[PDB]
Amino acid sequence: GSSGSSGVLKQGYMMKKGHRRKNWTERWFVLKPNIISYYVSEDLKDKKGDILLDENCCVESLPDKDGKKCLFLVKCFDKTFEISASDKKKKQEWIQAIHSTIHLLKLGSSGPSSG
C-alpha cells in the first residue's frame, strides 16, 4: 500500500477570521498531518502562521453568524483559529480531516518532562 508519506493532506481557499478586525478574507490553507499552516495564497511563499496540532487541539462546529453558513473554529491549548467554509462539503470535509489528523497524534502520546 502506502508506507512513508510526507507533505500536506488538504489544501484550498478558506476564509480566516482576523481576530484583529471582525471581517473575513480569503486565504490559502495547508492542512498538515501534524500541523496546519495558512498562506496568503496557494503559492506557499508568504506564510502567516502555523497551528501546532495535538490531541489537545480540536475542531468544533459553529452556528450561523454575521450572515455566514457552515462556520467552524479550532480550539487549541491557548491559541485559537476561527475559519469559515464555503459549503457543507468543505466545512465537513475539512473538520473531518482536521479531527482525524489529530487523533493520529493521540495514538502516540509521550509524557513531557516538566520541572
Short mmCIF file of N, CA and C in Angstrom, two decimals, residues 7-11 14 16 28-39 47-54 57-59 72-76 81 83 94-95 97-102 105:
data_model
loop_
_atom_site.label_atom_id
_atom_site.label_comp_id
_atom_site.label_asym_id
_atom_site.label_seq_id
_atom_site.Cartn_x
_atom_site.Cartn_y
_atom_site.Cartn_z
N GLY A 7 4.07 15.48 3.66
CA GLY A 7 3.53 16.61 2.91
C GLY A 7 2.20 17.08 3.47
N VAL A 8 1.43 17.78 2.65
CA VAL A 8 0.13 18.30 3.07
C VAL A 8 -0.98 17.30 2.75
N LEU A 9 -2.00 17.27 3.61
CA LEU A 9 -3.13 16.37 3.42
C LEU A 9 -4.25 17.05 2.64
N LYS A 10 -4.61 18.25 3.07
CA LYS A 10 -5.67 19.01 2.40
C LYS A 10 -5.19 20.42 2.07
N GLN A 11 -5.81 21.02 1.06
CA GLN A 11 -5.46 22.37 0.64
C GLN A 11 -6.60 23.02 -0.14
N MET A 14 -9.83 29.15 1.97
CA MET A 14 -10.75 29.30 3.09
C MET A 14 -10.74 30.73 3.62
N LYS A 16 -10.43 33.04 6.69
CA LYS A 16 -9.99 33.12 8.07
C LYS A 16 -10.47 34.40 8.73
N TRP A 28 -5.27 30.97 1.66
CA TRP A 28 -4.92 29.58 1.40
C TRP A 28 -4.62 28.84 2.70
N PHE A 29 -4.98 27.56 2.75
CA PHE A 29 -4.75 26.74 3.93
C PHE A 29 -4.06 25.43 3.57
N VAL A 30 -3.13 25.00 4.41
CA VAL A 30 -2.40 23.76 4.17
C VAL A 30 -2.51 22.83 5.37
N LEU A 31 -3.51 21.96 5.34
CA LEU A 31 -3.73 21.00 6.42
C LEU A 31 -2.64 19.93 6.43
N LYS A 32 -1.73 20.03 7.39
CA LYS A 32 -0.64 19.07 7.51
C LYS A 32 -1.04 17.90 8.40
N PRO A 33 -0.26 16.81 8.34
CA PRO A 33 -0.52 15.60 9.13
C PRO A 33 -0.25 15.83 10.62
N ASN A 34 0.63 16.77 10.92
CA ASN A 34 0.97 17.08 12.31
C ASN A 34 0.97 18.59 12.54
N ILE A 35 0.20 19.31 11.73
CA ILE A 35 0.11 20.76 11.85
C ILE A 35 -0.85 21.34 10.81
N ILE A 36 -1.06 22.65 10.88
CA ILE A 36 -1.95 23.32 9.94
C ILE A 36 -1.49 24.75 9.68
N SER A 37 -0.90 24.97 8.50
CA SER A 37 -0.41 26.29 8.12
C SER A 37 -1.41 26.99 7.21
N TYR A 38 -1.23 28.30 7.05
CA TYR A 38 -2.11 29.10 6.21
C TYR A 38 -1.34 30.21 5.52
N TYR A 39 -1.28 30.15 4.19
CA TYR A 39 -0.58 31.15 3.40
C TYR A 39 -1.56 32.08 2.70
N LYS A 47 4.12 32.86 4.36
CA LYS A 47 3.46 32.17 5.46
C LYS A 47 2.88 33.16 6.46
N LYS A 48 1.74 32.81 7.05
CA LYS A 48 1.09 33.68 8.03
C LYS A 48 1.25 33.12 9.44
N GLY A 49 1.07 31.81 9.58
CA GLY A 49 1.21 31.18 10.88
C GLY A 49 1.07 29.67 10.81
N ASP A 50 1.28 29.00 11.94
CA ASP A 50 1.17 27.55 12.00
C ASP A 50 0.41 27.11 13.25
N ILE A 51 -0.51 26.17 13.07
CA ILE A 51 -1.31 25.67 14.19
C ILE A 51 -0.80 24.30 14.65
N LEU A 52 0.04 24.30 15.67
CA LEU A 52 0.59 23.07 16.21
C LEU A 52 -0.52 22.10 16.62
N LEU A 53 -0.78 21.12 15.77
CA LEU A 53 -1.82 20.13 16.04
C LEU A 53 -1.39 19.18 17.15
N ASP A 54 -2.36 18.72 17.94
CA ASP A 54 -2.08 17.81 19.04
C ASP A 54 -3.38 17.34 19.69
N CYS A 57 -5.54 19.93 20.84
CA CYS A 57 -6.22 20.73 19.83
C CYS A 57 -7.36 19.94 19.19
N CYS A 58 -8.45 20.63 18.90
CA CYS A 58 -9.62 20.00 18.28
C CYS A 58 -10.45 21.03 17.52
N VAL A 59 -11.39 20.54 16.71
CA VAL A 59 -12.25 21.41 15.93
C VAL A 59 -13.71 21.24 16.34
N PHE A 72 -16.96 27.13 11.36
CA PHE A 72 -16.23 26.24 12.26
C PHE A 72 -15.02 26.94 12.85
N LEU A 73 -14.57 26.45 14.00
CA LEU A 73 -13.41 27.03 14.68
C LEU A 73 -12.59 25.95 15.37
N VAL A 74 -11.29 26.21 15.53
CA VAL A 74 -10.40 25.26 16.18
C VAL A 74 -9.92 25.78 17.53
N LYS A 75 -10.03 24.94 18.56
CA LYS A 75 -9.62 25.32 19.90
C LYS A 75 -8.35 24.57 20.31
N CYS A 76 -7.28 25.31 20.55
CA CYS A 76 -6.01 24.72 20.95
C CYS A 76 -5.68 25.06 22.40
N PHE A 81 -8.15 29.42 16.41
CA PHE A 81 -8.20 29.69 14.98
C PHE A 81 -9.62 29.57 14.45
N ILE A 83 -12.09 29.75 11.36
CA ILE A 83 -12.14 29.69 9.91
C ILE A 83 -13.57 29.51 9.42
N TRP A 94 -13.38 19.27 5.73
CA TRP A 94 -12.27 19.87 6.46
C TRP A 94 -12.26 19.39 7.91
N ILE A 95 -13.27 19.79 8.67
CA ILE A 95 -13.37 19.40 10.07
C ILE A 95 -13.06 17.92 10.26
N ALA A 97 -11.21 15.90 8.34
CA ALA A 97 -9.78 15.67 8.15
C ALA A 97 -8.98 16.19 9.34
N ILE A 98 -9.28 17.42 9.75
CA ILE A 98 -8.58 18.03 10.88
C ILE A 98 -8.72 17.18 12.14
N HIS A 99 -9.95 16.78 12.44
CA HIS A 99 -10.22 15.96 13.62
C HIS A 99 -9.41 14.66 13.57
N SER A 100 -9.47 13.98 12.43
CA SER A 100 -8.75 12.72 12.26
C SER A 100 -7.24 12.94 12.36
N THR A 101 -6.76 13.99 11.72
CA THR A 101 -5.33 14.31 11.74
C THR A 101 -4.80 14.34 13.17
N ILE A 102 -5.59 14.87 14.09
CA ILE A 102 -5.20 14.95 15.49
C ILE A 102 -5.22 13.58 16.15
N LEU A 105 -2.25 11.63 16.38
CA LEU A 105 -1.28 12.07 17.37
C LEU A 105 -1.60 11.48 18.74
#
